[PDB]
Amino acid sequence: THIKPSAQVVWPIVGQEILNGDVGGGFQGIQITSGFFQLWRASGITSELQLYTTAIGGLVMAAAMFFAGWFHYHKAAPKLEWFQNVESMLNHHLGGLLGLGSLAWAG
Amino acid sequence: AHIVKIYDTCIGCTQCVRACPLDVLEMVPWDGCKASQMASAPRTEDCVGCKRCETACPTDFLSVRVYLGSESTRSMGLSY
Amino acid sequence: EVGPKRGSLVKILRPESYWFNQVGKVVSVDQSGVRYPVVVRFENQNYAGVTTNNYALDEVVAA
Amino acid sequence: DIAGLTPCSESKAYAKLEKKELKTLEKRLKQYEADSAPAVALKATMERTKARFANYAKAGLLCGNDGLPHLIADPGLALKYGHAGEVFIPTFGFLYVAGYIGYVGRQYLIAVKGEAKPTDKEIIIDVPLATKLAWQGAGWPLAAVQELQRGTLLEKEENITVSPR
Amino acid sequence: PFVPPSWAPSVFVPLTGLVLPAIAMATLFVYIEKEAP
Amino acid sequence: WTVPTLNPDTPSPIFGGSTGGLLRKAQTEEFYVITWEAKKEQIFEMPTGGAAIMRQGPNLLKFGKKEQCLALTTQLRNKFKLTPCFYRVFPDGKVQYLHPADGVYPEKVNAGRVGANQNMRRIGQNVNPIKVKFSGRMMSPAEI
Amino acid sequence: ATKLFPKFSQGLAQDPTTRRIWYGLAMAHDFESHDGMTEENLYQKIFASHFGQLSIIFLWTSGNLFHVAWQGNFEQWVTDPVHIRPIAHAIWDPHFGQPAVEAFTRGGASGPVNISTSGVYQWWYTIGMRTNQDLYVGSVFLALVSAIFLFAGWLHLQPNFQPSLSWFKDAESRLNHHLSGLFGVSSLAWTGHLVHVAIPESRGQHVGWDNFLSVLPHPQGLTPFFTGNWAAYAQSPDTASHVFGTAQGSGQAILTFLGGFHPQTQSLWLTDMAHHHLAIAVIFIVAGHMYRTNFGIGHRMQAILEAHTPPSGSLGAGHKGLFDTVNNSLHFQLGLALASVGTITSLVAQHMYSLPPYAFQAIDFTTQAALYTHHQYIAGFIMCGAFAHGAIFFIRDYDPEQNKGNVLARMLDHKEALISHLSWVSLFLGFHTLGLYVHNDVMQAFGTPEKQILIEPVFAQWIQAAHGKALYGFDFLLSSKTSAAFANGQSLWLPGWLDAINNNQNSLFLTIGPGDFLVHHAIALGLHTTTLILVKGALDARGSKLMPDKKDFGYSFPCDGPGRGGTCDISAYDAFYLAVFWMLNTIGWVTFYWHWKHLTLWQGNVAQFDESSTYLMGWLRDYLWLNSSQLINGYNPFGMNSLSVWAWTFLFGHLIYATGFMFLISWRGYWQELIETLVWAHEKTPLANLVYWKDKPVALSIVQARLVGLAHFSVGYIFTYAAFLIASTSGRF
Amino acid sequence: MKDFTTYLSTAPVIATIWFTFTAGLLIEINRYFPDPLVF
Ligand code: CLA
Ligand code: CLA
Ligand code: CLA
Ligand code: CLA
Ligand code: CLA
Ligand code: CLA
Ligand code: CLA
Ligand SMILES: CC1=C(/C=C/C(C)=C/C=C/C(C)=C/C=C\C=C(C)\C=C\C=C(C)\C=C\C2=C(C)C[C@@H](O)CC2(C)C)C(C)(C)CCC1
Ligand code: SF4
Ligand SMILES: [Ca+2]
């Protein structure tokens, strides 16, 4: 209720360190308005260790996404018939992506 | 009506005639270029001033030149 | 065989030409009596993207 | 001294501004514990502020009634009254660097122009040649005078295109 | 001396800015729409 | 080849109509009528918007301006390799054949055609405007 | 069918669309383009049009005099010009609410009225006007003068009174008359009014057509004038204790050279202005005897120009052929007149504020602000017009064969050099003037104002020192009491001048610092950029590499189509249109600078400008935001005040300015297709289809849209600033 | 590798590298010589 969320710290150069405002909690930085602090609290994160572990996970996922992109274009490229399976695509996106995603989040 | 003029620099490419969307130009027999044909503008009254002919003209400078002039129902391309 | 030699470099003299005071290569000269028999090719394209044009013998000079 | 200005070293407004600046930083240094990283940072800014006000005064800068340093740009007043590090020397420093960039770039364009595809050497930079010219650009001023004196720097009007007039 | 009455504005302002504009617009519109003999 | 006569009772391509059709100008000033022969029923695009089915053999359509007729003329010739012809029709019953004027499309050089609006000079040989000043009206050195 | 309007262009008269109405109005004063136009008829039409313009100007002045004498408080303002607010005219609005009537009731009450910011009250008071009878008589006279110019206009166009083209071409005779009579005799007649009426009125003596002959302008009469004892006329001038309008502290001199300002009025001395007009009158009358007309003596302008050719060939054929070039080109003649009048208009703005000629003018801050901004904006438009006509001259009148090798043709031969150099200067000023402001803003934002770049305007301060100001300690010329320039003028004007130039409460050579340095370079940026745009338009008006035959298309044409990469805004008219934005930006910067420096001086804290003008946040917060409070509170949920009209106008200008953006950003094609849909809707709507249009509705043309957008943009620009300027100055003072 | 070095020689890449070098040089200078107003 008193400490202002801050997650960007600037280097002390050409006098720009003034932007590191007194946000509270013995911390100096730029006040953020993305709402991440409240999202992380809602998710139940209570340590910077959990935030660091998710960051590493996201990079592992980013590497996987870039791999998938290279693999599905240079190694195993789906044919047009595959992409034209709209009935199958909707069944998986409604049941898997959306319904499973919502079920997992409820967990 | 807009003033359309053809110049001796014409090479008889017929591109302007093919580009015209109102049939203002045509090819007439000539002896000034190797193609033995030169562009002519016998229906300028139907010209709107799109200048597509000039865009199609490849000579430097243009062999076909359009000078926007008096405005009419045809010149303004009005369907009303 | 009137006109400049093929493959020779000539400078344009036509004032309204994009390549005025610029040098191009003589692609071919029409021996037939055409108004502009010298076909010249240029490296730089004009505003229309064209890189060739026909000029009269007087409009061109070895350079 | 000049223009009725006064040395920052003797200006009272210059002194009040330095106190005003340090008092803002100090009002903030209080809310933090002595060794706290926030405290260390505010202290380093206070030291940098003290050094700036001292370094500027030592450089003999003049200050207006606003208590802020004013720069003398007249070559005559600057040299006679000790104010040449403010605009004069900076001018010859910039002119050397700016001419350096220009002469090297001109040398590059001239070199790639005699190649098969100059346009290709402008989108893909011939790094080795570019690095060579970059190092040889230190003596550009003498090279520029030697080109100006050989009449090789400029182009003949007869070879430059112009509109009909 | 060359002084208009108090009602001047109560009459001049209405005439100039409403009545005269209407009259001017009417004649002008007619002339433009008129065609050469 | 002779100047063709427009048969006004020609069958029109199948089309339910649109809102981009003729306006009051067709009844007061003039309208345009394109005609062509189709070797097979093919759906085509109306220059005024919408799909329409050309009928076997003769076909007739009416457009508000010449550009719309030539636009349809372009599609039929380029896509279906057909050879259409169009006319300008006045409200008094008068019909005027327009394209192809001589039965040979303009891009193809044809004899008999006499050059018009041609200048035996390059544009750079035009006089300065000061020379054509105070003439009967505003004119360009090119017009002289 | 062919409509009657316009009668000057059958082409337009045969246009069946709404464009005919717009173009008929837009091309009515372009006589050269009218059907069947001859050079002689061109001159006669212009001559009559000029009489018409004069008629309108004199009626405008008569109208102004009448409303002040009938609805204002001139006879009350003269009694207390320091605390009485001048009334422009009465307000009769039936849409007003009882509160608005009370808010606008002022200046001696008498109902709702507008206060005058024109400065006619101080002007007429200074020239001797003292009563509404005097104002009424003047109004009648000027109304009569207007009718004569209107009749002369009508007559000099009737047969047996239509001057020949040769008369219009008699340059040597016209210049002799305009210099000796229009300028010299007029100035001499003005000296007579000042000496016989204005000065006696300032000394408390009424001098009117009733007693002007039985009154002596000077106690010694004209004996000093005809004996050569002119100095006598300078003896015994008004003293520092002179109460303007009374014989208190009043002297007897009629021509002096005191210099500086009258102590109470803070304006120039009437005796100094009388002597000024007398001296310039003599100079002009003499100058009017230089050209040869009919008596065997005088110069032939053609011979003069033909002789001015540098012997080294540095200027080619020199000024050969220029006589005929100028004499046969009205556009060339108009270009020079606009360029000269426009520069002179800016001088009026700079000199009237620094050396106020009218009594109690410098204390009327609102009038001072209004006059400077008004003349600086009119000057900007005139300068733009000058280049526009220079570009038209090149396209319509320039004949290369008759100007071969001359200075004019040389200009065209190095146009790329001229333009490229104007491009370089503009770039330098723009990059550095912007870079220094941004650096200063960042230094202010990071809380380090001692780190900002503040270059002292030493070169300008040195000039001010030369003129006498000793604040900078340069000690030279008038600032040096041991200088000859100081001693020679010690018994003439210097004393009064030095007192004024050393007083930091007037506007005579205001003190300048780093903020003034930055804004002056911003003004230089605007002047060079606007000139670059205008010059480039005139030099490329006849042709370019993209359009080599532009001359065959005329001054104003939409474009040359999308071919050749695209050719939007390629005409010289398009260059003028783009230059107007830069001119408005330039006059905006200059008027902002003038207003802010005076607001701070008038308030008594020049330090605010000196410390806030060095960064753009300072301009936005300490000038625009801070000075807008009272104006935006002209009307609010709690009521309205006399500033309500300005609050409403301020927003009215913002609306027109933004409406211009629509004509400037959105182009014809989109609108033409929208109108076609409406034409279908009207013809398909029952009952509505019964009524029809005589002119086929069409979207505005490309050139028309650029003009309509620029007009809306320009009108909102002026209305917005005028509303802000008057409100900020009046409300604060 | 030759094609990769040619790609690294492309205008945008060289600009990023050159500007990063120039920016870095200026930043480091102000890091070791803070508040430089005069020579
Ligand atoms: C070392 C790995 C590698 C290599 C050698 C190649 C090589 C090739 N790829 Mg490829 N690709 C890869 C990985 C790789 N790819 C991956 C991981 C993906 C998944 C995204 C793809 C997806 C892909 C597609 C869809 C296509 C290619 C194509 C091609 C061929 C020509 C295009 C090209 O590469 O030009 C070089 C292109 C670039 C260098 C652009 C880089 C794009 C990045 C990802 C954008 C980054 C933007 C940044 C995040 C934000 C910028 C903001 C700004 C403010 C700075 C070429 C032989 C094209 C082809 O087959 O030829 C027609 C083709 O269409 N690739
Ligand atoms: C349970 C089945 C399933 C799931 C979960 C997904 C999920 C997704 N698909 Mg998809 N798809 C499926 C089946 C599925 N698909 C089938 C059967 C077909 C063939 C008809 C397609 C064809 C298809 C196309 C053509 C496209 C997608 C795309 C996408 C992505 C859209 C981005 C988004 O909104 O989500 C947000 C993103 C996330 C939540 C990140 C998490 C994603 C992880 C990897 C979940 C795993 C998904 C994957 C299908 C699982 C198998 C991986 C395995 C082969 C190694 C998304 C992650 C779009 C895409 O390009 O994605 C790259 C797209 O264009 N899909
Ligand atoms: C570019 C515009 C410009 C302007 C507006 C000025 C303006 C001024 N300069 Mg200058 N100066 C300039 C460029 C300029 N300078 C350049 C490019 C140089 C490099 C050589 C110099 C070198 C220079 C010197 C050495 C001196 C000045 C001085 C001065 C001041 C008096 C000079 C004078 O009498 O007339 C104006 C001068 C010019 C228009 C051009 C150059 C200045 C001349 C050549 C110097 C002659 C000064 C002379 C001795 C008068 C001062 C007497 C005494 C007080 C020394 C004056 C305010 C004098 C001064 O006040 O020093 C304290 C001085 O001695 N300037
Ligand atoms: C003594 C002889 C004489 C006089 C007095 C005039 C006077 C005039 N002639 Mg003219 N002319 C003459 C002889 C003369 N002419 C001869 C012999 C010929 C044949 C060769 C011509 C051929 C001729 C032509 C073709 C034209 C004129 C025109 C004009 C008018 C110019 C309009 C104008 O700009 O306003 C007046 C100009 C001035 C008063 C000059 C002063 C301007 C300064 C810069 C203003 C400064 C004022 C002061 C500083 C501040 C004022 C503050 C306060 C009072 C507001 C003007 C009233 C024009 C015309 O007809 O207009 C209707 C025009 O077209 N004349
Ligand atoms: C003595 C001064 C003077 C004279 C005699 C002329 C004379 C001429 N000019 Mg010109 N001009 C001048 C000054 C002058 N100009 C100035 C100062 C400028 C800069 C602004 C210009 C800029 C200019 C341009 C760009 C052009 C001309 C053109 C012309 C010629 C025909 C245009 C015309 O008059 O048609 C009629 C003029 C009009 C109908 C005016 C148009 C309407 C404008 C936008 C005013 C609208 C303002 C509006 C009322 C504001 C409302 C606010 C309210 C609601 C509160 C003509 C011979 C044109 C030309 O060269 O011919 C081809 C042309 O292209 N002038
Ligand atoms: C705030 C609006 C604005 C600004 C800033 C400018 C600025 C400029 N105009 Mg312009 N103009 C404007 C509005 C504006 N105009 C409008 C509304 C019109 C009417 C349509 C015109 C019409 C106009 C014309 C006709 C001409 C100009 C010209 C110019 C240039 C004059 C030379 C100069 O000053 O160089 C100074 C340079 C600058 C001020 C730019 C600053 C450098 C940048 C900001 C630094 C880089 C930042 C960073 C490193 C990288 C940012 C990008 C990032 C994504 C990486 C100049 C850059 C003239 C011209 O083209 O010059 C030859 C000219 O011909 N203007
Ligand atoms: C403040 C600037 C401004 C304003 C006022 C408008 C206004 C309008 N725009 Mg527009 N626009 C603008 C800027 C502006 N635009 C800019 C900068 C762009 C560039 C992106 C565009 C691009 C744009 C497009 C592409 C379109 C519009 C359209 C419209 C119209 C929408 C229909 C409508 O609301 O009619 C009602 C009129 C109003 C709401 C104006 C209010 C005026 C007041 C309330 C009336 C007062 C009348 C007064 C009493 C008359 C007496 C005066 C007296 C002297 C006699 C509308 C009039 C659309 C259109 O054409 O219409 C369908 C359209 O398609 N605009
Ligand atoms: C060699 C070089 C290049 C330069 C090429 C060329 C041709 C540059 C042209 C220079 C020309 C023609 C200059 C012409 C006139 C210059 C003049 C009159 C000099 C004005 C300078 C003045 C008045 C000095 C002002 C001051 C001095 C003493 C320094 C400071 O104190 C500031 C100030 C203003 C007080 C290329 C190719 C751009 C590439 C790159 C390297
Ligand atoms: S401007 Fe358009 S309509 Fe006119 S001749 Fe050229 S292509 Fe045809
Ligand atoms: Ca009196």
Side-chain angles (χ1 to χ4, degrees), chain B residues 10-12 27-38, chain C residues 34, chain F residues 109:
Chain B
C10 180
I11 66 184
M27 299 307 300
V28 299
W30 189 40
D31 65 88
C33 67
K34 211 197 109 53
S36 301
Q37 56 175 164
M38 180 178 178
Chain C
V34 288
Chain F
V109 59

Side-chain angles (χ1 to χ4, degrees), chain G residues 25-26 29-30 334 338 381-382 384-385 388-389 392 396 555 573 576 707 711 715 719:
Chain G
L25 301 170
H29 293 167
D30 191 12
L334 189 49
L338 293 178
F381 278 105
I382 298 183
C384 288
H389 287 281
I392 304 160
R396 293 185 174 181
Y555 177 70
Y573 176 97
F576 161 91
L707 173 59
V715 165
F719 271 74

Side-chain angles (χ1 to χ4, degrees), chain D:
Chain D
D1 305 345
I2 316 165
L5 300 173
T6 65
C8 300
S9 71
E10 306 174 351
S11 166
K12 305 192 313 299
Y14 187 71
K16 196 154 307 184
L17 175 60
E18 176 179 2
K19 287 170 182 52
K20 178 180 180 295
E21 296 197 12
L22 291 169
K23 202 180 58 59
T24 309
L25 287 169
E26 193 243 7
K27 192 176 183 182
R28 298 172 54 201
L29 171 61
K30 177 154 304 180
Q31 69 208 334
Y32 296 123
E33 288 74 4
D35 64 1
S36 66
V40 172
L42 288 170
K43 283 168 184 298
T45 289
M46 289 178 70
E47 299 319 305
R48 285 193 295 265
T49 303
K50 294 190 187 72
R52 185 174 57 250
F53 275 89
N55 294 4
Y56 285 177
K58 183 191 186 186
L61 282 162
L62 303 181
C63 269
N65 314 357
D66 53 16
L68 304 168
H70 293 186
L71 304 194
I72 303 299
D74 175 37
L77 291 164
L79 298 180
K80 177 181 180 57
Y81 296 98
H83 296 291
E86 304 178 5
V87 179
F88 199 72
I89 305 179
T91 294
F92 289 104
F94 169 94
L95 285 184
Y96 175 74
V97 180
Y100 200 128
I101 304 174
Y103 191 82
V104 170
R106 182 176 182 271
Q107 291 300 327
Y108 184 85
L109 288 183
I110 298 178
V112 300
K113 213 59 65 64
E115 313 294 348
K117 298 205 103 297
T119 62
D120 295 19
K121 284 187 170 297
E122 295 183 356
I123 56 175
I124 318 299
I125 298 303
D126 190 329
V127 176
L129 166 61
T131 299
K132 185 193 65 59
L133 299 173
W135 289 116
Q136 299 183 6
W140 74 263
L142 300 83
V145 165
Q146 292 301 357
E147 291 190 5
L148 184 56
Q149 286 177 325
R150 305 291 88 74
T152 314
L153 178 76
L154 291 185
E155 184 61 41
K156 296 181 299 180
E157 178 178 357
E158 53 176 338
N159 310 332
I160 308 176
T161 191
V162 283
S163 304
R165 303 294 199 271

Side-chain angles (χ1 to χ4, degrees), chain G residues 313-379:
Chain G
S314 56
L315 295 188
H319 298 82
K320 178 164 171 292
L322 280 192
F323 179 76
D324 279 333
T325 301
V326 175
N327 200 230
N328 302 348
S329 173
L330 292 169
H331 293 286
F332 199 108
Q333 302 171 23
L334 189 49
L336 301 170
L338 293 178
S340 304
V341 171
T343 306
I344 291 309
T345 308
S346 291
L347 200 63
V348 165
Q350 303 285 17
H351 292 189
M352 285 198 62
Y353 94 83
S354 56
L355 299 166
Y358 305 129
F360 310 103
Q361 158 192 352
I363 57 176
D364 199 349
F365 306 153
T366 304
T367 296
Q368 278 282 37
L371 287 176
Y372 186 86
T373 308
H374 161 95
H375 279 111
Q376 288 291 22
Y377 270 104
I378 293 183

Side-chain angles (χ1 to χ4, degrees), chain F:
Chain F
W1 177 89
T2 57
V3 174
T5 301
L6 172 55
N7 173 297
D9 198 7
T10 297
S12 291
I14 320 172
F15 184 60
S18 65
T19 59
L22 302 175
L23 290 173
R24 191 176 307 187
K25 169 192 169 186
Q27 314 162 353
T28 66
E29 310 186 14
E30 67 195 18
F31 62 99
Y32 299 77
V33 172
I34 184 178
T35 59
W36 68 100
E37 293 285 333
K39 180 186 177 180
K40 59 171 281 62
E41 279 224 340
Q42 309 206 46
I43 298 186
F44 63 95
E45 183 174 357
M46 293 285 299
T48 57
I53 310 177
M54 69 182 59
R55 299 181 173 274
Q56 178 64 32
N59 280 292
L60 180 152
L61 285 176
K62 298 176 170 57
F63 291 111
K65 63 181 185 177
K66 182 182 181 185
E67 190 181 3
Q68 296 171 351
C69 286
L70 198 51
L72 182 52
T73 296
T74 298
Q75 174 185 186
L76 294 172
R77 295 175 56 190
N78 291 2
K79 180 184 313 175
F80 314 91
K81 285 61 195 60
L82 304 177
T83 58
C85 67
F86 59 76
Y87 314 73
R88 168 181 295 104
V89 183
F90 308 89
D92 61 77
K94 174 187 175 183
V95 177
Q96 174 192 11
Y97 178 76
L98 299 181
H99 164 93
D102 51 347
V104 172
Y105 289 111
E107 71 284 355
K108 307 163 301 177
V109 59
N110 192 24
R113 299 177 177 177
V114 156
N117 291 318
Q118 293 172 339
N119 300 353
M120 296 308 97
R121 66 177 183 269
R122 55 176 169 267
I123 307 192
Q125 293 168 341
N126 288 347
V127 308
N128 292 283
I130 186 56
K131 312 299 178 178
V132 298
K133 173 182 284 295
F134 290 129
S135 179
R137 79 301 179 183
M138 305 173 53
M139 73 176 312
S140 173
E143 313 180 19
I144 85 172

Side-chain angles (χ1 to χ4, degrees), chain E residues 8-23, chain G residues 92:
Chain E
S10 303
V11 173
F12 284 80
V13 178
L15 298 180
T16 311
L18 226 177
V19 178
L20 302 181
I23 314 302
Chain G
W92 190 88

Side-chain angles (χ1 to χ4, degrees), chain A residues 66-67 69-70 73-74, chain H residues 7:
Chain A
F66 287 110
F67 169 83
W70 164 85
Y73 187 82
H74 298 271
Chain H
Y7 165 80

